[PDB]
Write a protein that binds this ligand. Structure first.
Ligand SMILES: Nc1nc2ccccc2[nH]1
Ligand SMILES: Nc1nc2ccccc2[nH]1
Ligand SMILES: Nc1nc2ccccc2[nH]1
Ligand SMILES: Nc1nc2ccccc2[nH]1
Lengths: 243, 243, 243, 243
């Protein structure tokens, strides 16, 4: 996360950390608990090539990474079949936990938006995670969870911006219809935040509007952070996750 | 270049090296001379974002990198407007030199194939460059120009292979129509060879069938090297390069 | 620390961590509390060249680095005037804190040995620190304080071993009189543990026999870890630290 | 080499490059041809621990490293028995070649100074090599041999300088009597130049006064380059090398 601060212990109870086997269970991507037994994340974090379930673990909300770990095994990885690269789209995936987690006020699910829900440009939303605090700058120990308020940006405006200072023809889509943008030159997501949540509070109730997907650098001019638009893939999600 | 060997001094007179400014003019991509004033290369080597021309230089056929340099400045960089990523396609671009080069048996242009040439499996083709000799393994000094004969594979077969061991739906095409596959687990192109030529001997003449574009790793099982299919972009090239 | 394991919460109340300013206050050397206002460490950790005091801070006993930091500033750095390199000797230094610390069962001083104590082979001794767990292998997060029991080895025996597989003349002493050896191919100190304490339980009390100083690699055959022999520098220490 | 330039092809015919087996025969230190079959170099380049001769090779004078290599096998490595570290002294060694070299005007031996020869403070001498051009700054391809004129510095003055800004007692020798210094904040030797020669033209002949040994940083204030004093070890040298 770029341009944000450490999150209060009572904030973002649905945030999760994905760990990969190694000298130690290292954090490589974020995710969100959308059901007691299901985690939502980005496809590029666990694909497109098939990965060994035994080398993956999920860690529920932690104030500091690695300090009070309680790793959970994953029983199944479901990557959207239309996914190959983030730039092409469908950057979304599901992780079925071995056991349904025991929800508490400190750790619980985030609510998904209704199919008709559309987050307007400028609406203040939040992105969270343990990723880099700037281009090539790793989050330093003790690795606190970070948060940053970012305003939603209209898909068309975002697409236009990405063409600025680029050779790509203005008529050639870069930011596609299943993607959403947010952030600016001071606040953005970054490597390591991928798969994590972008939440906006509507009628009270926090709704997850997107999944951290990709971008060109972090907080770079005319290069807003790009997310997978959750509403676009609700049918696919609800094909595996109980409503 | 993975596998293969050092190229004879008389071979590949059209090979060029792209250099980026810094502590020394370092090689970052390949290319080919297709006209005394024009170099053909890959779009991902110079795009999708517009970079400063001043920071780019071209080196014509050299037996070893850096030892006998005579760097040439560029006046224009033109990238296919459809380009954004190599996985999507249109990974091709042109560089116009500030002056026409003098040709000879040691340095001259490569011939482009006629629109109808398909380059089927069994066709004798070679790829050349100063790229890595293996995954994560750079070409060691004195940096000789390497070459390797690679077997052509039909797009449909190649696409099927890229789906093996991947979550991507079988009907979601990975190897696209404007692309071409070549190589195996012993012969392939690698990082650093990008933008370089894949040439095939047809009826006694060398024709550039492709431009080193991308691939998953180098010489990895079920993951042959991918090239931009030159015949697919002949009309675009001819808008800029005199015949 | 190579071998051994995570130290219990109640052990080594005198262990200290030296921090250098930068992206975060990073651990670079060990140390021990020998007086409410003084820390004993290795000269090579802070010398031979004079560095800015401001860029240094001390962290008293804590289970995991960076988690519960309470950094303490230093008013003075005193390095043995005979020091230039660890191999030559006199690798010992003192840090005076700006304020005396409050002691308790969880944080208190370690007892220095009587001038006559020799710490012969067979005596039970432990070395502690947050250093590498193996050659060029850092302690992974959450960075627990490690400990390991190491076997003492007589100086002359150690010296002979250091000559095995070396061009150095047998009569040219390598392990000097102001030094002490401990450890084997399974138990040893390593980079990052430097300045830390080697303590032995004598007549029911813990005495600091040495300070982690140097060695060829970590836990390498015929190359035991080398420590500064505390008894040799008691007079110097007592010139600054009161009883 | 710091602050110098490319050496003319006709100069320094006695310069050699030591290579170590690996992906390629990489340069790791310099040396000088002092006899048709003997190379003089620094002990720390090949010691203190014994290494097998099979992984070592010698390359005679070439304008650019790796370009037109003609590697020579070594029959024996002789390290001074009093050597353990550069800071202690005796940093000198001999490499006996498998065959005597056929000297030419382009490649021949350098002359060793008489036992009584004393190089006065201020005398203009030269140090040559393929080492870093600045701290942590490697020599860029094509790796030309570099040279730099450095003035001799009186031993006492050099020792005094090394104490400035250090904790070491003024009466404790840092630069010893078997060592020699030269260079300033603009011109100096650096990592990779070790084992190489420092030659001074006395009257009308080039004499090798020193062997690049060590220092604190390169071209750093009050930290001139330190070399092993050749006249100090003339007897040891002539014990193996025919006069
Ligand atoms: N702006 C931005 N946000 C990002 C998150 C993950 C990877 C690349 C990114 N670029
Ligand atoms: N086989 C192959 N060739 C490549 C060239 C550039 C990047 C990735 C590649 N994989
Ligand atoms: N064996 C050993 N132990 C060491 C501790 C610090 C630096 C080098 C070392 N080598
Ligand atoms: N000044 C200086 N010259 C050096 C040559 C080799 C290693 C360290 C050095 N420091």
């Amino acid at each position: 996360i770029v341009g944000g601060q450490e999150a209060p212990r009572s904030k973002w109870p649905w945030q999760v950390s994905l760990r990969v086997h190694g000298p130690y269970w290292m954090h490589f991507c974020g995710g969100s608990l959308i059901h007691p037994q299901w985690v939502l994340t980005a496809a590029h974090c666990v694909g497109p090539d098939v990965k060994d379930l035994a080398a993956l673990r999920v860690q529920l909300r932690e104030q500091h990474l690695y300090y009070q770990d309680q790793l959970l095994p994953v029983s199944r990885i479901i990557v959207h079949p239309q996914f190959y690269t983030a730039q092409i789209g469908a950057d979304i995936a599901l992780l079925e936990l071995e056991e349904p987690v025991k929800v508490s006020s400190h750790v619980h699910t985030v609510t998904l938006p209704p199919a008709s829900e559309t987050f307007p440009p400028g609406m203040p939303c939040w992105v969270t995670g343990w990723g880099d605090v700037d281009n090539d700058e790793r989050l330093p120990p003790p690795f606190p969870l970070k948060q940053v308020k970012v305003p939603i940006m209209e898909n068309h405006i975002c697409d236009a911006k990405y063409h600025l200072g680029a050779y790509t023809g203005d008529d050639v889509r870069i930011v596609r219809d299943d993607m959403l943008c947010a952030g600016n030159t001071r606040r953005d997501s970054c490597q390591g935040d991928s798969g994590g949540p972008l939440v906006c509070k509507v009628n009270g109730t926090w709704l997850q509007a997107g999944v951290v997907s990709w971008g060109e650098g972090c907080a770079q001019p005319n290069r807003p952070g790009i997310y997978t638009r959750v509403t676009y893939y609700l049918d696919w999600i609800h094909h595996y996750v109980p409503k």
